[PDB]
Design a protein around this ligand. Structure first.
Ligand SMILES: *[C@@H]1O[C@H](CO)[C@@H](O[C@@H]2O[C@H](CO)[C@@H](O[C@@H]3O[C@H](CO[C@H]4O[C@H](CO)[C@@H](O)[C@H](O[C@H]5O[C@H](CO)[C@@H](O)[C@H](O)[C@@H]5O[C@H]5O[C@H](CO)[C@@H](O)[C@H](O)[C@@H]5O)[C@@H]4O)[C@@H](O)[C@H](O)[C@@H]3O)[C@H](O)[C@H]2NC(C)=O)[C@H](O)[C@H]1NC(C)=O
Ligand SMILES: O=C(c1ccc2[nH]nnc2c1)N1C[C@H]2C[C@H](S(=O)(=O)CCc3cc(Cl)cc(Cl)c3)C[C@H]2C1
Ligand SMILES: [Ca+2]
Ligand SMILES: [Zn+2]
Ligand SMILES: [Zn+2]
Length: 808
């Protein structure tokens, strides 16, 4: 209940929210059904439209109009945004050639440039080019400001998770909003778009931009709006707020449009009906920019034009039904659409087995338009597992399709032609970023980037200190004219040992054999230089990674590779090696197939042993540096050391073998040599961060040898391919993957065929930022290049998507 007896007289869109049961007058009062009786009357005038006409000029102030053209309106700060235009012979902003804004040009009283966030729902990246002829204002912004060809949302590519990520720089797994619809099992409640649950503050984690602002002395406009409030009043309210006196005027503002998403669902991404929604948006933009020119703020304010996601062609008849795969279709709840999420209908059930549910859903029709995963097995770049609100069973749906439970749900719950929510790397989901203002750069294109990064930047524009988030602060410095944040490499925590020869063959009882006995001052002095690291600057191109936690490890040099070997985990943390274009693939000689040699630099006590592997019929082994790419038959023995060996399921070895034997050489040819760093990853609790010694859930049977949950490689080369990797002057180029270490190849439906038909496809799906691997390993790469640190942060955030050219 609320006594709505109070009044909004002079409180129209007040900024401090008063508490029940007195009536509110802010842009959220509607959604809580708690407005004062006169709110509609006083605060939402509509009379005479939103534009001045000639006859309206100089007029007599009438408080009933929606906006004014009366002489005193500039003073009152409430003119129609075109007042200067029709009444004062002034041109529109869109018509002025754009002048570089070399310094802020702000009126007396503005202690800092304000920031306006203009967010547009469902604004697909390719709109900027395709709809350009009917969006001149937005095309002005793009072309004079700083733009990216596209910006990448988070997964799921849905509205709530994506808007809240903009405001926090957090993955949904961390912020709490993992879907538009969610079930929390500790709350036993459901978050849906309709209804009032989504209002309880308990769903919303992280610290959003406006709280960050308040907590540090910067006042904020309120971000959310109410659906019935038209866009014109939304603009005029933002300009009114900007006319407030210095001590009350917010410094950060938000605008939001339901379009073009609302139509995209109706007409599809490119339906001819779409031109109007776009025309509208552009007009709204024009109205902000004209309004800011009226207030002398158009060369003072920084504007961010940003979308939350894109839009794909989707229709009813492209629905896949679980009822055609399952029998007990009724002992499951499904969260449907462009992503599936499954749980037991009741926890009263002990007969409920996910293993059989997954199997029932795996590669079961040749045509299949989805794929089941357990959430811990989803690609790590999706960062979609570490939250109780994410159900164990996830369905990745194909672009252009839906998953539903039964058919009844689709005709009784065709009307739509567009949707969104697919994998964040799918082209049609990409969205927009343009930045315009004094602090942004002038006529500047920047590379595509992930939206989790904007929070840091928006804090920079405000002089705020960003709350702990998932961006990599400094990775977007190249967007800005001048930045308050000069980033610095983290400090090495653990320094390495450099062990020489300290053990004799006979001290090792490891159960390994090797045919290596057949045995010169000139070529003995030589390989000594290899074990001290005389070819280290060939295989360690960017300096050694740093270890950012306390642990005991040894560096190990060889002719063809070099490693950081963990006495704790009994295997290397990283292994680094350069393969030049000219290098050639040889095969493992018949005699050395089962060769495993002790490493006389490392004690028997801190070594793996062949015995345990023999005893464990589930587990086999692999090597980090591949023997196939040894530079000489002699150097090859180096690859068989007990300290280059890692545990690997037979099924994984297939994957690994073909990566090592075929793809490395291929990349080396296409890229002009590559530098490869490879290693294990342990993330048993799937939080995207390295596990500690005492969080290991799986050892090789009868040993203290941990089993990785994943395998990574980082493949680097010269961005200019005419330069070999090992002699690169300028910028670098990189691609990486985090491969799940799994005992079967159920993920690949063509897996019984030749590796050449399915392995590279899997690797692609599990593409990765170097930054993701840093979280998962606790290492820090690229410590010694010729490149600026900011450039190196940009590079560690890059993700190679394997999607073709945006637009067509
Ligand atoms: C992306 O970036 C984030 C932020 O930097 C990283 O997540 C941080 O990781 C660390 C280590 O795991 C956590 O530290 C622990 O924190 C607790 C106390 O923390 C409390 O207070 C903080 C800060 O005020 C608060 O954010 C936490 O709130 C969580 O839990 C709420 C429910 O109880 C929930 O409403 C909220 O959304 C948030 O939930 C998520 O995080 C928790 C982690 O605690 C997780 O269990 C849950 O599933 C959600 O994902 C919390 O009450 C200390 O006592 C511990 O000792 C420990 O140091 C930070 O809490 C955590 N911060 C956030 C915001 O999640 C991610 O690791 C990073 N991802 C990657 C891949 O790098
Ligand atoms: O109906 C939809 C909607 C939109 C599309 C869809 N597709 N499929 N289903 C969809 C449903 N909606 C109404 C809601 C209110 C807005 S809001 O005004 O609260 C966001 C303002 C804001 C801006 C920033 Cl920058 C950050 C944050 Cl956190 C919030 C969010 C919601 C969308
Ligand atoms: Ca972990
Ligand atoms: Zn949206
Ligand atoms: Zn939508």
């Amino acid at each position: 209940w609320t006594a709505t007896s109070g009044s909004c007289k002079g409180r129209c869109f007040e900024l401090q929210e008063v508490g029940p049961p007195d009536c509110r007058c802010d842009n959220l009062c509607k959604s809580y059904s708690s407005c004062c009786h006169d709110f509609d009357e006083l605060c939402l005038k509509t009379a005479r439209g939103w534009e001045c006409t000639k006859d309206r000029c100089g007029e007599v102030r009438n408080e009933e109009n929606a906006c004014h053209c009366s002489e005193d309106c500039l003073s009152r700060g409430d003119c129609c945004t075109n007042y200067q235009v029709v009444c004062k012979g002034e041109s529109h902003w869109v018509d002025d050639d754009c002048e570089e804004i070399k310094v802020p040009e702000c009126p007396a009283g503005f202690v800092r440039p304000p920031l306006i966030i203009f967010s547009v729902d469902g604004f697909r990246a390719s709109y900027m080019k395709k709809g350009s002829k009917v969006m001149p204002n937005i095309e002005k912004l793009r072309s004079c400001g700083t733009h990216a060809p596209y910006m990448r949302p988070v997964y799921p590519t849905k509205t709530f998770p994506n808007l809240y990520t903009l405001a926090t720089g957090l993955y949904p797994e961390s912020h709490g909003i993992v879907g538009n619809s969610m079930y929390d099992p500790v709350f036993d409640a459901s978050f849906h778009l309709r209804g009032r649950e989504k209002f309880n503050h308990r769903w919303w984690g992280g610290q959003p931009l406006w709280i960050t602002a308040t907590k540090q002395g910067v006042r904020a406009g309120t971000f959310f709006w109410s659906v019935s409030i038209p866009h014109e009043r939304r603009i005029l309210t933002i300009l009114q707020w900007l006319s407030l006196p210095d001590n009350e005027r917010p410094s950060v503002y938000a605008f939001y449009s339901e379009q073009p998403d609302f139509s995209g669902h109706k007409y599809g991404p490119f339906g001819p009906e779409m031109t109007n929604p776009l025309r509208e948006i552009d007009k709204t933009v024009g109205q902000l920019m004209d309004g800011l020119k009226q207030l002398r703020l158009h060369r003072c304010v920084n504007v961010i034009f940003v979308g939350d996601h894109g839009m794909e062609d989707v229709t009813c008849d492209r629905t896949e039904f679980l009822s055609n795969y399952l029998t007990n279709v009724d002992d499951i709840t499904l969260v449907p659409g462009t992503l599936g999420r499954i749980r037991a209908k009741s926890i009263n059930n002990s007969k409920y087995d996910p293993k059989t549910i997954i199997a029932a859903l795996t590669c079961k029709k040749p045509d299949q338009h989805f794929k089941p995963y357990m959430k811990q097995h989803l690609p790590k770049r999706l960062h979609y597992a570490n939250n109780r609100r994410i159900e164990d069973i996830h369905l990745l749906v194909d672009r252009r399709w839906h998953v539903a439970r039964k058919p009844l749900d689709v005709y009784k719950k065709c009307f739509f032609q567009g949707d969104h929510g697919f994998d964040n790397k799918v082209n049609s989901m990409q969205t927009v970023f343009v930045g315009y203002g004094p602090t942004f750069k002038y006529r500047t294109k920047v590379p595509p980037f992930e939206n989790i990064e904007l929070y840091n930047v928006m804090c920079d524009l405000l002089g705020l200190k960003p709350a702990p988030n998932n961006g990599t602060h400094g990775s977007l410095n190249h967007l800005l004219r001048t930045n308050t944040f000069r980033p610095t490499m983290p400090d090495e925590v653990s320094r390495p040992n450099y062990p020489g020869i300290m053990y004799l063959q006979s001290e090792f009882d490891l159960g390994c054999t090797c045919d290596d006995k057949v045995e010169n001052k000139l070529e003995e002095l030589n390989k000594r230089l290899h074990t001290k690291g005389s070819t280290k600057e060939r295989h360690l191109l960017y300096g050694r990674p740093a270890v950012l936690y306390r642990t005991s490890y040894d560096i190990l040099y060889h002719t063809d590779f070099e490693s950081g070997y963990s006495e704790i985990f009994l295997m290397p943390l990283w292994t680094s090696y350069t393969i030049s274009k000219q290098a050639e693939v040889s095969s493992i000689p018949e005699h050395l197939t089962n060769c495993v040699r002790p490493d006389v630099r490392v004690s028997p006590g801190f070594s793996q042993n062949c015995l345990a592997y023999k005893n464990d019929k589930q587990m086999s082994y692999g090597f980090l540096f591949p023997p196939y790419l040894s530079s000489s038959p002699e150097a090859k023995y180096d690859a068989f050391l007990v300290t280059n060996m890692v545990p690997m399921y037979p099924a994984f070895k297939r994957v690994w073998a073909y990566f090592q034997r075929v793809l490395v050489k291929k990349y080396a040819s296409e890229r002009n040599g590559v530098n490869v760093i490879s290693g294990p990853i342990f993330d048993y609790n799937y939080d995207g961060l390295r596990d500690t010694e005492d969080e290991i859930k799986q050892y090789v049977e009868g040993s203290s040898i941990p089993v990785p949950t994943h395998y990574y490689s980082i493949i680097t080369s010269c961005l200019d391919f005419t330069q070999p990797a090992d002699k690169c002057d300028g910028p670098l180029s990189v691609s990486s993957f985090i491969l799940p270490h799994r005992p079967d190849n159920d993920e690949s439906c063509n897996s019984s065929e030749d590796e050449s038909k399915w392995v590279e496809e899997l690797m692609k799906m599990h593409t990765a930022r170097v930054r993701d691997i840093e979280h998962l390993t606790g290492l820090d790469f690229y410590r010694k290049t010729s490149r600026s640190y900011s450039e190196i942060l940009t590079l560690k955030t890059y993700l190679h998507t394997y999607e073709s050219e945006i637009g067509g």
